[PDB]
């Protein structure tokens with residue numbers, strides 16, 4: 001229909017190999033922060049058959065048992081037997097971690113007042129919010145995340161014991177344009193691929209995915225006779241996890257954020273402390289965007305910020321409201337200037353970013369869930 | 383001024399550790415394609431002090447010497463001595479490469495007619511084009527790439543022998559809104575950070591970066607008394623490359639594409655053959671977008687496509703012209719349907735994607751350069 005369009009987003013499960021890496025990187029970050037709130041962490045993880053490798057830079061007063069931290073994260077995910085393709089008890093854990101470069105340390109935080117610490121790198125970051133859901137997230141990505149969460153729930157409760165931890169989902173929604181804002185009309189296509197055991201047949205899996213997963217997550221009002229379902233479209237997914245596909249930290253940055261909506265600056269979140277603005281400034285930009293929507297100034301908004309390594313204040317700030325505010329974008333920038341301080345050394349205080357809650361962010365998206373500090377809107381003064 | 387806004391993009395040099403990984407992943411892909419045009423390649427690279435690790439899946443009839451291919455790529459980049467922090471002659475090259483999962487192979491390409499091969503994965507991809515430059519790319523990212531290329535040029539020609547291969551640049555441009563299209567007005571801020579030797583002082587570097595790099599790349603009409611320069615803002619960058627920061631393939635996906643403009647689906651390009659739609663469908667979507675702009679239908683356009691693993695046709699196609707076309711987005715979709723076939727098995731033929739030219743794409747962006755097939759517009763019939 002005229003004034004309508006399609007949009008597709010995807011999500012992945014806790015056992016998707018890239019997501020395994022994000023969760024391990026954040027389990028390492030949390031382990032350091034539990035002992036040293038000022039740990040400087042830049043922990044990349046790589047996963048392939050039988051291997052977790054940690055590579056990066058950590059300067060911290062914590063004493064962390066990497067073998068224990070990695071294996072416990074893999075256990076939580078559900079890879080606990082060679083029949084599943086990966087086992088926390090018996091995999092190889094390799095560590096190539098060095099101290100943070102002293103050249104970065106001197107230029108960013110050494111001998112600097114905390115509020116005046118420099119950005120840990122240059123870069124650009126975006127925040128986005130949309131009133132199409134209560135949580136201010138796109139419906140395409142919320143549904144895709146919930147489909148993966150439902151698969152994990154039915155695997156863990158033994159309802160569908162043939163399920164394995166590696167999964168991917170994708171949701172296409174037809175939207176109506178509404179003066180810059182968007183209104184979901186219907187779900188056009190759903191894809192679900194999930195690793196499974198050798199005994200279950202394709203028809204049993206497809207029936208369960210439709211009746212016990214899709215129907216348990218997606219409201220029936222969005223599904224109709226024309227909705228297309230691609231359930232186990234490859235036909236066979238016994239080999240999975242790192243054995244099926246090498247994973248790396250920071251290779252699901254669009255799943256971690258807005259599912260293609262808004263914009264992205266390229267930075268990965270997991271394995272990084274607050275001084276790395278790829279994470280802290282993106283969380284602050286989401287906080288700003290969500291505050292503008294919950295404050296009734298916008299129905300849909302995009303915020304860009306950027307930084308230079310060693311410099312505290314952002315180099316640029318831009319706001320695009322998609323035509324959904326009566327205030328000009330110059331007025332919105334002034335409101336943001338009066339209400340937020342986007343220096344990393346102030347974001348850490350506002351968003352409590354030395355707290356070890358990062359492993360919780362590393363699956364199912366970093367935004368629109370669980371009332372993390374960046375999800376609690378700031379009451380704006382203007 | 384009213385109707386203006388700021389936008390920032392970044393780029394990185396050939397020796398940036400993430401970019402080293404993209405180039406090595408693509409050198410491995412090209413090595414396979416030189417002997418086996420139908421090689422199935424999914425090669426991730428990880429780089430840290432003294433180490434290149436290859437992890438992933440390759441099924442190919444080629445006989446490839448990974449030690450030689452990796453070291454030759456590192457040599458080309460310029461890491462040829464321990465004084466520079468990395469040396470192709472003496473680094474460790476580790477290989478954890480297995481065959482492609484037979485479950486993926488059976489679901490995607492085994493016993494399938496080439497035109498009817500399934501997408502190698504699910505996912506979403508975007509194409510973008512803007513008439514603000516002849517090459518139909520955002521000026522922010524074109525300038526950022528050219529600044530890194532200039533640093534490599536002056537390093538290689540011996541003009542600035544203190545330069546090392548690892549660099550990052552960032553450009554903020556103030557734009558004027560023009561009926562959906564954008565017009566660059568001026569450069570607001572430039573950042574340049576580049577690895578250097580122990581002997582050169584900060585003032586000599588900052589003077590050279592302004593006079594020999596910025597002035598040699600950015601037209602003077604964009605620079606004025608208010609332009610902000612952050613040159614070597616960390617103050618010291620002797621440690622660099624993988625020693626300073628662990629790199630991974632597919633961690634510069636926004637540098638590889640549009641610098642934050644348009645949209646991104648999350649997929650990485652390097653190390654993947656044509657059957658991986660993260661690369662082929664994104665190249666085809668750029669080709670569509672550039673064809674719509676060069677054909678005079680749009681001044682600025684975004685194209686989304688999506689796929690399911692094992693299914694040839696895209697699941698969804700969407701076009702947003704930012705208000706820059708007289709044709710409706712329904713009409714543009716019909717023109718695209720009549721002129722393009724976005725099945726991966728047809729994109730391979732149109733864009734010649736079995737040719738080993740991929741290492742050439744892995745630095746300075748995959749788009750807007752060198753008249754690759756996806757940069758030559760298709761003449762549209764309607």
Ligand SMILES: Cc1ccc(-n2c(=O)c(-c3ccc4nn(C)cc4c3)cc3n[nH]c(C4CC4)c32)cn1
Nearest residue numbers: 005177178179180181261262645684686700701702
């Ligand atoms: C990153 C991004 C995300 C979404 C879109 N997107 C859109 O935002 C609108 C839209 C929304 C609301 C509207 N209100 N009015 C009065 C006009 C509107 C147009 C239409 C549209 N079609 N395809 C796309 C993109 C997938 C290619 C679109 C654009 N860029």
Ligand SMILES: Cc1ccc(-n2c(=O)c(-c3ccc4nn(C)cc4c3)cc3n[nH]c(C4CC4)c32)cn1
Nearest residue numbers: 263302304318319320387559560561562563643644
């Ligand atoms: C991904 C993306 C990129 C750019 C923008 N972006 C824009 O596209 C326009 C714009 C361009 C042209 C226009 N013509 N007319 C009549 C109105 C226009 C508005 C203004 C604007 N301000 N901040 C941003 C984003 C950085 C936050 C903006 C939005 N999204």
Ligand SMILES: C[S@@+](CC[C@H](N)C(=O)[O-])C[C@H]1O[C@@H](n2cnc3c(N)ncnc32)[C@H](O)[C@@H]1O
Nearest residue numbers: 193234236237244245424439482485486502503
């Ligand atoms: C298709 S793989 C990427 C391509 C792969 N590296 C190759 O060698 O072709 C990407 C993701 O798809 C999922 N996957 C793996 N095996 C699959 C299968 N047989 N069917 C469907 N999806 C699968 C996993 O979540 C995996 O991380």
Ligand SMILES: C[S@@+](CC[C@H](N)C(=O)[O-])C[C@H]1O[C@@H](n2cnc3c(N)ncnc32)[C@H](O)[C@@H]1O
Nearest residue numbers: 042057100103104120121575616618619626627
């Ligand atoms: C700042 S590092 C990322 C943070 C780092 N992992 C850490 O431990 O803090 C990201 C990129 O910045 C660049 N870089 C490295 N050392 C730098 C320095 N001393 N000054 C400026 N940029 C530097 C390199 O291009 C590097 O890949």
